[PDB]
Amino acid sequence: RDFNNLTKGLCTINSWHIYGKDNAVRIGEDSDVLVTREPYVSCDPDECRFYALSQGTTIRGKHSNGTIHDRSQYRALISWPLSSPPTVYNSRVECIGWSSTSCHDGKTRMSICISGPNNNASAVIWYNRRPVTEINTWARNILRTQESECVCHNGVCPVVFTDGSATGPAETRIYYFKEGKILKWEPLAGTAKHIEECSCYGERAEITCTCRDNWQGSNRPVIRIDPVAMTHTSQYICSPVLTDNPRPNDPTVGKCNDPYPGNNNNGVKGFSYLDGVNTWLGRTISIASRSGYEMLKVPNALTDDKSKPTQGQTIVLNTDWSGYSGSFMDYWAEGECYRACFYVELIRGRPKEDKVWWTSNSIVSMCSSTEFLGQWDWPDGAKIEYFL
Amino acid sequence: RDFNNLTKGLCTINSWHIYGKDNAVRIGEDSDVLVTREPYVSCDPDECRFYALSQGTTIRGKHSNGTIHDRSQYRALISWPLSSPPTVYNSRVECIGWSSTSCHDGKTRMSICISGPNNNASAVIWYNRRPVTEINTWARNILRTQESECVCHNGVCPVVFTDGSATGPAETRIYYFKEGKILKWEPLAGTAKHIEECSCYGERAEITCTCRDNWQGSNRPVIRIDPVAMTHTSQYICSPVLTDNPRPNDPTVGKCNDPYPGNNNNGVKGFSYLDGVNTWLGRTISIASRSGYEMLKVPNALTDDKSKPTQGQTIVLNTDWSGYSGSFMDYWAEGECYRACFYVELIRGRPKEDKVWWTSNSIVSMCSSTEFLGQWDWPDGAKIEYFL
Amino acid sequence: RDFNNLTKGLCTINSWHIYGKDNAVRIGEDSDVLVTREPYVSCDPDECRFYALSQGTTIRGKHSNGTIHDRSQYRALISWPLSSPPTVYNSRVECIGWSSTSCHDGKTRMSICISGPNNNASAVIWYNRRPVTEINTWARNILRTQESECVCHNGVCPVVFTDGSATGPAETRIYYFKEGKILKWEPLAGTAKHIEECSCYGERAEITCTCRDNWQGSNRPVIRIDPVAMTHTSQYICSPVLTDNPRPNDPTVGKCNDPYPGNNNNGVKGFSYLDGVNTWLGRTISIASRSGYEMLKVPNALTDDKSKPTQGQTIVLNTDWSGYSGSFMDYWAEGECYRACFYVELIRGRPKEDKVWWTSNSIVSMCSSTEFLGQWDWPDGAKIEYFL
Amino acid sequence: RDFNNLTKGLCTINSWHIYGKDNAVRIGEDSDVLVTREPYVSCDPDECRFYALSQGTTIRGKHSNGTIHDRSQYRALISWPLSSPPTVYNSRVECIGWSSTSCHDGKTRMSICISGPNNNASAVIWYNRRPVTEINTWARNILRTQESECVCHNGVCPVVFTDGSATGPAETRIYYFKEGKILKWEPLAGTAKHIEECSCYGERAEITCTCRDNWQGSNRPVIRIDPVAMTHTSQYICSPVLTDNPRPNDPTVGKCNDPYPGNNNNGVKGFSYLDGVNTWLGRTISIASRSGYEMLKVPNALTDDKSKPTQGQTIVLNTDWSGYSGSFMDYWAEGECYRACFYVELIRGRPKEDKVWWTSNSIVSMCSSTEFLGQWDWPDGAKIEYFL
Ligand SMILES: *[C@@H]1O[C@H](CO)[C@@H](O[C@@H]2O[C@H](CO)[C@@H](O[C@@H]3O[C@H](CO[C@H]4O[C@H](CO)[C@@H](O)[C@H](O)[C@@H]4O)[C@@H](O)[C@H](O[C@H]4O[C@H](CO)[C@@H](O)[C@H](O)[C@@H]4O[C@H]4O[C@H](CO)[C@@H](O)[C@H](O)[C@@H]4O[C@H]4O[C@H](CO)[C@@H](O)[C@H](O)[C@@H]4O)[C@@H]3O)[C@H](O)[C@H]2NC(C)=O)[C@H](O)[C@H]1NC(C)=O
Ligand SMILES: *[C@@H]1O[C@H](CO)[C@@H](O[C@@H]2O[C@H](CO)[C@@H](O[C@@H]3O[C@H](CO[C@H]4O[C@H](CO)[C@@H](O)[C@H](O)[C@@H]4O)[C@@H](O)[C@H](O[C@H]4O[C@H](CO)[C@@H](O)[C@H](O)[C@@H]4O[C@H]4O[C@H](CO)[C@@H](O)[C@H](O)[C@@H]4O[C@H]4O[C@H](CO)[C@@H](O)[C@H](O)[C@@H]4O)[C@@H]3O)[C@H](O)[C@H]2NC(C)=O)[C@H](O)[C@H]1NC(C)=O
Ligand SMILES: *[C@@H]1O[C@H](CO)[C@@H](O[C@@H]2O[C@H](CO)[C@@H](O[C@@H]3O[C@H](CO[C@H]4O[C@H](CO)[C@@H](O)[C@H](O)[C@@H]4O)[C@@H](O)[C@H](O[C@H]4O[C@H](CO)[C@@H](O)[C@H](O)[C@@H]4O[C@H]4O[C@H](CO)[C@@H](O)[C@H](O)[C@@H]4O[C@H]4O[C@H](CO)[C@@H](O)[C@H](O)[C@@H]4O)[C@@H]3O)[C@H](O)[C@H]2NC(C)=O)[C@H](O)[C@H]1NC(C)=O
Ligand SMILES: *[C@@H]1O[C@H](CO)[C@@H](O[C@@H]2O[C@H](CO)[C@@H](O[C@@H]3O[C@H](CO[C@H]4O[C@H](CO)[C@@H](O)[C@H](O)[C@@H]4O)[C@@H](O)[C@H](O[C@H]4O[C@H](CO)[C@@H](O)[C@H](O)[C@@H]4O[C@H]4O[C@H](CO)[C@@H](O)[C@H](O)[C@@H]4O[C@H]4O[C@H](CO)[C@@H](O)[C@H](O)[C@@H]4O)[C@@H]3O)[C@H](O)[C@H]2NC(C)=O)[C@H](O)[C@H]1NC(C)=O
Ligand SMILES: *[C@@H]1O[C@H](CO)[C@@H](O[C@@H]2O[C@H](CO)[C@@H](O)[C@H](O)[C@H]2NC(C)=O)[C@H](O)[C@H]1NC(C)=O
Ligand SMILES: *[C@@H]1O[C@H](CO)[C@@H](O[C@@H]2O[C@H](CO)[C@@H](O)[C@H](O)[C@H]2NC(C)=O)[C@H](O)[C@H]1NC(C)=O
Ligand SMILES: *[C@@H]1O[C@H](CO)[C@@H](O[C@@H]2O[C@H](CO)[C@@H](O)[C@H](O)[C@H]2NC(C)=O)[C@H](O)[C@H]1NC(C)=O
Ligand SMILES: *[C@@H]1O[C@H](CO)[C@@H](O[C@@H]2O[C@H](CO)[C@@H](O)[C@H](O)[C@H]2NC(C)=O)[C@H](O)[C@H]1NC(C)=O
Ligand SMILES: CCN(CC)C(=O)[C@@H]1OC(C(=O)O)=C[C@H](N)[C@H]1NC(C)=O
Ligand SMILES: CCN(CC)C(=O)[C@@H]1OC(C(=O)O)=C[C@H](N)[C@H]1NC(C)=O
Ligand SMILES: [Ca+2]
Ligand SMILES: [Ca+2]
Ligand SMILES: [Ca+2]
Ligand SMILES: [Ca+2]
Ligand SMILES: [Ca+2]
Secondary structure (H helix, E strand, O other): OOOOOOOOOEOOOOEEEEEEEOOHHHHHOOOOEEOOOOOEEEEOOOOEEEEEEEOOOEOOOHHHOOOOOOOOOOOEEEEEEOOOOOEOOOOEEEEEOOEEEEEEOOOOEEEEEEEOOOOOOEEEEEEOOEEEEEEEOOOOOOOEOOOOOOOOEOOEEEEEEEEOOOOOOOEEEEEEEEOOEEEEEEEOOOOOOOOOOOEEEEEOOEEEEEOOOOOOOOOOEEEEEEOOOOEEEEEEOOOOOOOOOOOOOOOOOOOOOOOOOOOOOOOOOOOEEOOOOOOEEEEOOOOOOOEEEEEEEOOOOOOOOOOOOOEEEEEEEEEEEOOOEEEEOOOOOOOOOEOOEEEEEEEEEOOOOOOOOOEEEEEEEEEEEOOOOOOOOOOOOOOHHHHO | OOOOOOOOOEOOOOEEEEEEEOOHHHHHOOOOEEOOOOOEEEEOOOOEEEEEEEOOOEOOOHHHOOOOOOOOOOOEEEEEEOOOOOEOOOOEEEEEOOEEEEEEOOOOEEEEEEEOOOOOOEEEEEEOOEEEEEEEOOOOOOOEOOOOOOOOEOOEEEEEEEEOOOOOOOEEEEEEEEOOEEEEEEEOOOOOOOOOOOEEEEEOOEEEEEOOOOOOOOOOEEEEEEOOOOEEEEEEOOOOOOOOOOOOOOOOOOOOOOOOOOOOOOOOOOOEEOOOOOOEEEEOOOOOOOEEEEEEEOOOOOOOOOOOOOEEEEEEEEEEEOOOEEEEOOOOOOOOOEOOEEEEEEEEEOOOOOOOOOEEEEEEEEEEEOOOOOOOOOOOOOOHHHHO | OOOOOOOOOEOOOOEEEEEEEOOHHHHHOOOOEEOOOOOEEEEOOOOEEEEEEEOOOEOOOHHHOOOOOOOOOOOEEEEEEOOOOOEOOOOEEEEEOOEEEEEEOOOOEEEEEEEOOOOOOEEEEEEOOEEEEEEEOOOOOOOEOOOOOOOOEOOEEEEEEEEOOOOOOOEEEEEEEEOOEEEEEEEOOOOOOOOOOOEEEEEOOEEEEEOOOOOOOOOOEEEEEEOOOOEEEEEEOOOOOOOOOOOOOOOOOOOOOOOOOOOOOOOOOOOEEOOOOOOEEEEOOOOOOOEEEEEEEOOOOOOOOOOOOOEEEEEEEEEEEOOOEEEEOOOOOOOOOEOOEEEEEEEEEOOOOOOOOOEEEEEEEEEEEOOOOOOOOOOOOOOHHHHO | OOOOOOOOOEOOOOEEEEEEEOOHHHHHOOOOEEOOOOOEEEEOOOOEEEEEEEOOOEOOOHHHOOOOOOOOOOOEEEEEEOOOOOEOOOOEEEEEOOEEEEEEOOOOEEEEEEEOOOOOOEEEEEEOOEEEEEEEOOOOOOOEOOOOOOOOEOOEEEEEEEEOOOOOOOEEEEEEEEOOEEEEEEEOOOOOOOOOOOEEEEEOOEEEEEOOOOOOOOOOEEEEEEOOOOEEEEEEOOOOOOOOOOOOOOOOOOOOOOOOOOOOOOOOOOOEEOOOOOOEEEEOOOOOOOEEEEEEEOOOOOOOOOOOOOEEEEEEEEEEEOOOEEEEOOOOOOOOOEOOEEEEEEEEEOOOOOOOOOEEEEEEEEEEEOOOOOOOOOOOOOOHHHHO
16 A cells, blocks of 8 residues: 555563464474475565575475575575465465565565575565565675565665675675665664674664674674664664673673674574663573573663663573574554564574484564563474484 | 344254365375364354364374373464365464464454463464454463354454363353453353353354353353343253263253252363254263264253253264364354354364374364254264274 | 356357366375366356365375265365366365255356265255255155256256156256255156256256266256246157267167167266257267267257267277266356367276275366367376376 | 557666576475476566476376376476476466467466377467367477467467477468467468477567577577567577587587578577677587576677677586576566566486486576676586485
């Protein structure tokens, strides 16, 4: 109809209720489910769907051998109905590639897929299910993007990309697209020293992205974008409640403009809702691996370097595998506010479970409630032994 | 379009004709059919569909082992086209949880799924395929609901929930929802002493629910709701034709306001159409287990404590497994009256057939005819031996 | 929109071109294809689909054992996209039963399914995907119907049923339905002595049905219906080119009002287009079994007792299995005339191929061309050996 | 809505970006994927889809044995969503046959399938999913057509057919259809000496077809059609960069009106975009077999007999199997020009990989970019060893 505009603020998050879960690996043990990773959730005005990067093979198929690898010519961004698994028969390919993002602007959807060898990748921007724009690698070192949904405001849908090293300074750019065409792009600015896989959401005409400093920081870099002025700033979450993984143990004081040191060259896609006292951070429970998952209310996390949790909710037990996590919201729901939501990728297989030769995942997602709901834990649920 | 209003009375039930049957277990022996239980049927203005609580695995899948258990994080309310089986590829997830209800109000559908551990469950009310309201457990003991469709009148869709013990007095509430938001709730009143899994239908602006007294009664509690005044009453079916299971043998006189004693702490979801002389009761044939199924015309059952059958029809032979049964009607059909319909859950597997490690079911449903039709029996039809 | 009216005459049939083929048994050897029989084809104003009576099991499934039997509680009328196979995932159940018919009147579709034990069957008439009318068995001996599409004219859709013996006189009725309700019914009249499985088509406000005299005739009975006056007549195809199976060898002179003797108590559903010189008959090649299939132009077959073929076309080689055949046309196509079409059921399995324990079929269908096209033969194509 | 008219010229081709890839053989190793060959891509105003000639069996099915053969009664033109594989459950049959073409005219689609024995084939033209016209074989020697999409302009959709020898002069015709009816047909004229499988595209009211001279030429014949005057001309691509396969090595000078000699009686469906300096040719890398695939910019190829490449892009490595290739464009995209696109058929199985008894393929397709994008290679990706 008309372009959606971020006119509401966030609903108060007092707890998280279950939204979707596909139990993909469980079901896929005996049905035609595609091997995936790097999933996310994204809504259209009339439907919300699961998204992920297929590996071009089923979990039980012999070609599932080797799916731990990230970039091949057999990957593609696919979407399928909420809470269903990604099967060969219900998955809709949005585009071909090994890195992506996607978002609906109110009129139609923009999907971006990047493909290519490490030194010659290229992004192709799709709008209304048609290829419209292409961007060639600028640093010739794995051009890559969010791996979660982008956000639009009056037709402008900014997207963060990084090209260059993952263990040293790199070339991050913020592209502002409208109808799949480039309106403008900026280099990254602010104090964030390295950006990877930004998780974004929008409220009151401002887009907030919590990303991953793969180089030095265990605290998360944040990129706040103004989609009208088409400008942005960058810093880190000030809070000592560190949310990357692997990471050191929490200090009593965090860092606002530098990576918090302790772990180099590694991390995990993650997210947060930074909204004054209505601030919640997601993180793996384990400081060593992608194990477990919890949400912690840390009032003023973004700007208070001594902020510690005041409430929390466990999502996945530390005795269960987790993985990537990102934000999305249904900007077309009824009501006066935007209900924050997120998904957690539950990785199964390699490298942690090497008795199988594949790597895949299932998805669990939650959204906020103004009630103070009881909590449950949501594991993947598959028994690796069955796949042997 | 506009909210549907219960303006018609029931059509005269002179017999039952076959409506739908999915032969799920038969077909699922060699195809991707999800393991389910607690099924039901529910209509939209333009389509009637089968519903059930999937177990997040196929019947032939190795994860089918253990599906006798009721509540896990892998369950979800799913719906699929009438008479098809619930397959991985045609099942649409309505929400995540191990207890549910769903109904269309004329404009759109409301689905409710409850999930959580025993002492911390929570219900989330979905409307127009979006999460709108959440209710936390009030007795901290398996918050649960109907397991069959709710009914709406002018936007108000009442739903009965129970929280607390299943073998002692509990906390039952009647929630009146409109567009997924709570208009009001009451505590249970009347003479029913315990309520579980209400089966409901509506006619002439009154909603009747036949439920399950799991604690002491073998006769069924009935909750009649006024969706305009948003008030209700409760009693038991007066008739000596006892309809719960397990149950004692039929007496010559029933009880109108107390459970009929003889069997404690057990039962089965069931239903009835209470309409003066046009009154029909459904019950398993066996007084000991969920075996067989029949419909009996017992004029004035609800209010006559000596009422005995005047006509009847066998649905499932006592030499075949049955299970839950509930009511639904197509409130958007043509004609001057509402055609009563019901479904019977045909449980296969555990606990009665323990040579297999799973528990699932198929569905058979009938609707009334003003003709006096010949009868046939409708078993599940699968040979357990094939699954060994 | 508005009720379709049979306003056109038939196009001239100079040959037959391929229309649809699903290769169901071939494909089903390694995919989830339902076991079927008694197929047909039927069009809506915007789509033409294949129809058949599923057996409630896949061909490879263990429950495929025993599918030679005709009537069970696991059968249902299903429809699926043209030329696809009937799979568990694309088949749409129209109703439950072991005998059926279906037709679109221009506004919506009427489907009829009969179910029940031999002495207590009942038909239920569905309209707009809802149950509307029910008819109980009148002779208590396998109430049954066409097994191919019915035809409508201005809302009136006549259907022929038979109840009673298949090897002696029986009670055949012509029901005239409108919006799924009975407008009127007649007993069979005319000289046909026994009617089974009528194949019908309509042109210029007249409905012609070529049926099966299972009792004594090897020539085919024809029922011509006037859907406006709601009256009909009956006779046999006068032609010596006998078209039932099994049958005696062709004589030089046929019979116009009596069964042509030679074979008792057996036959096969078949059809014909009786249109003066534009008359074509379909028949198995073998006079002994359902083997092969050909179309023969026999000018004035219906009324000329010495009529012999003037042109012909082989459809299935006598070295391939055939089966039922029936008529249908797309009454919503463009043009000034109705293009005659038919389907041939290609039965595989029992009783002729007893190395397998199942019985199923695939479908091939053709429509007429005003060209004189070259011919090909269209067998099922599956290798039974593969199923062993 | 209204007939589409070829009003735009081609966009400048500076490189090729990935458009679609289905990884069919990879996925099909463990899922219900139909065996195919002779694929292509074609768009409707609201969707672009993959097309191919199914073999009426799955790749893992036992009937996959023998699929190297071209013409059987089990083949059919099917279409399925972009980048999905052709599965039994998502494939839509357009018509039955072993040779085809298809195109949307702006209002609806025309599909043509030819079937029959070698000496008696017949084409049937479908429009709006209905059979409208039939053409009988004129040379009685494998009537055949494009195997890729046709193009329309103001309702007129020309199609090239050939009937007669594949190793000697034959009878090629250009049919001009409108709404599936024949407006006119011509015999082939110009200097092309033999035509097979034309690959076409349209721009500025002119349709260009690059075909295959199976008889003597290693250079490609080109047929330029005027869909308004309904006339055409024919010649060969003048360029010494030879693009058929097998073929001799490139000379320094090509031939404009005669086949370039060196290889007789063989070839492969291929294509090109002839547009002055914006001219790009596709060809297998190997001069001996269907191995590898590249795009070469050869300014003025069609008319300059000494034209050699000025830029290029590898699509498939010479160490990977390729096959047929053809053109298509999305004539309903936004923008001022038509973005050239093509697909390459990646044949797997027989005859080159005879350890398996089948022959099938997957599809990769690209479209042009005005950017100068980095290149990647796109192989089928399946491991034959897994199928053993
Ligand atoms: C029914 O449902 C309800 C609803 O969910 C259940 O009630 C909930 O219970 C939750 C668990 O108790 C509770 O969550 C906790 O909230 C704490 C904050 O509340 C308390 O403090 C505030 C502030 O003073 C008070 O106002 C309030 O009244 C409470 O006293 C959080 O602090 C908790 O998180 C911390 O603990 C968990 C383990 O329990 C850690 O995993 C988590 O990371 C937090 O602790 C680490 O991080 C801090 C901060 O840096 C460190 O200080 C600390 O040492 C830990 O650090 C180590 O661990 C981390 C992670 O491994 C590592 O990185 C680091 O390096 C160190 O090794 C927790 O979130 C809910 O708020 C509460 N909800 C509600 C509405 O009440 C109820 O129990 C259920 N009922 C039943 C019967 O089960
Ligand atoms: C073709 O189709 C038609 C249409 O279906 C077939 O005709 C139908 O035939 C049915 C079976 O005969 C018949 O159903 C019965 O109706 C009886 C009522 O009708 C009779 O009584 C009335 C009233 O006086 C008369 O007007 C009428 O003319 C008849 O005489 C029911 O009473 C029957 O139900 C009872 O019996 C069945 C077993 O047959 C039990 O399973 C059932 O539970 C009922 O009996 C128990 O319950 C009562 C009540 O408390 C007890 O009194 C009794 O002792 C039994 O109790 C034991 O069993 C229960 C259950 O296990 C247990 O809980 C308890 O503790 C005790 O152990 C039955 O419903 C249809 O009405 C009739 N339909 C029509 C239209 O005619 C026709 O036969 C078919 N044709 C052919 C050729 O097959
Ligand atoms: C390319 O394509 C074209 C187009 O299809 C091919 O040309 C077609 O060729 C067909 C086969 O030759 C031909 O079909 C035949 O037509 C005959 C009628 O035409 C002839 O007679 C008329 C009338 O005088 C002449 O005008 C005309 O010019 C011809 O001379 C039919 O009579 C044929 O049917 C009979 O034969 C077939 C076997 O070939 C039987 O299976 C069939 O049942 C018919 O014969 C039985 O029935 C009659 C009638 O009672 C009996 O008299 C006879 O003895 C047979 O009876 C026995 O068999 C039956 C069945 O088993 C059994 O019940 C009974 O008891 C007895 O045992 C046949 O239909 C097409 O018309 C023709 N089409 C066109 C447009 O030309 C062309 O060949 C192809 N090209 C190539 C190179 O292959
Ligand atoms: C990141 O991405 C970019 C973008 O893709 C990569 O850059 C691209 O690199 C490509 C490969 O180098 C390049 O493609 C080549 O372009 C050549 C033309 O450019 C050159 O010449 C022009 C004209 O003078 C200059 O302007 C220009 O500056 C260059 O100097 C083509 O000629 C190449 O094709 C020929 O070679 C390939 C093998 O490399 C053959 O397979 C192909 O068939 C061509 O050669 C045959 O055909 C010719 C013509 O008849 C014969 O002369 C020759 O002998 C060969 O003939 C034999 O082989 C054929 C086929 O087997 C056989 O039939 C025959 O009988 C003989 O046996 C090639 O297309 C892109 O243009 C370039 N793109 C851009 C934008 O720059 C970059 O490298 C990537 N980065 C990294 C780090 O990898
Ligand atoms: C989001 O904001 C823009 C205004 O920036 C709205 O756009 C106006 O919409 C009306 C009807 O579409 C036009 O007549 C105005 O010219 C539009 N645009 C501008 C950019 O001035 C848009 O409608 C808003 N979105 C929604 C859902 O209300
Ligand atoms: C069910 O009843 C309500 C009346 O209670 C009907 O609502 C009225 O509908 C018309 C058109 O929608 C409005 O102009 C009135 O204001 C509506 N409502 C009220 C609540 O007064 C409703 O239309 C009835 N449903 C149907 C199908 O007729
Ligand atoms: C088939 O015939 C009936 C006439 O018998 C047509 O019905 C008339 O249609 C118009 C518009 O629907 C009405 O105003 C007339 O009253 C209708 N009916 C009768 C029964 O008189 C019908 O429209 C015809 N069908 C088609 C497709 O033209
Ligand atoms: C393609 O060209 C034809 C003109 O040749 C356009 O046809 C005219 O369309 C309008 C509205 O459809 C009619 O009133 C004219 O009579 C039409 N036709 C002719 C053939 O004169 C057609 O609309 C053009 N297509 C598009 C998409 O614009
Ligand atoms: C002619 C109809 N009769 C007699 C009942 C048949 O047995 C039909 O025969 C056959 C048959 O192949 O001849 C298949 C049908 N499934 C049967 N119909 C019913 C209702 O069972
Ligand atoms: C050039 C067309 N010819 C000669 C008939 C071919 O044999 C085609 O070749 C090939 C081929 O791979 O070269 C595949 C097509 N399936 C064939 N077409 C037909 C109709 O069989
Ligand atoms: Ca399988
Ligand atoms: Ca880090
Ligand atoms: Ca009880
Ligand atoms: Ca007979
Ligand atoms: Ca050649």
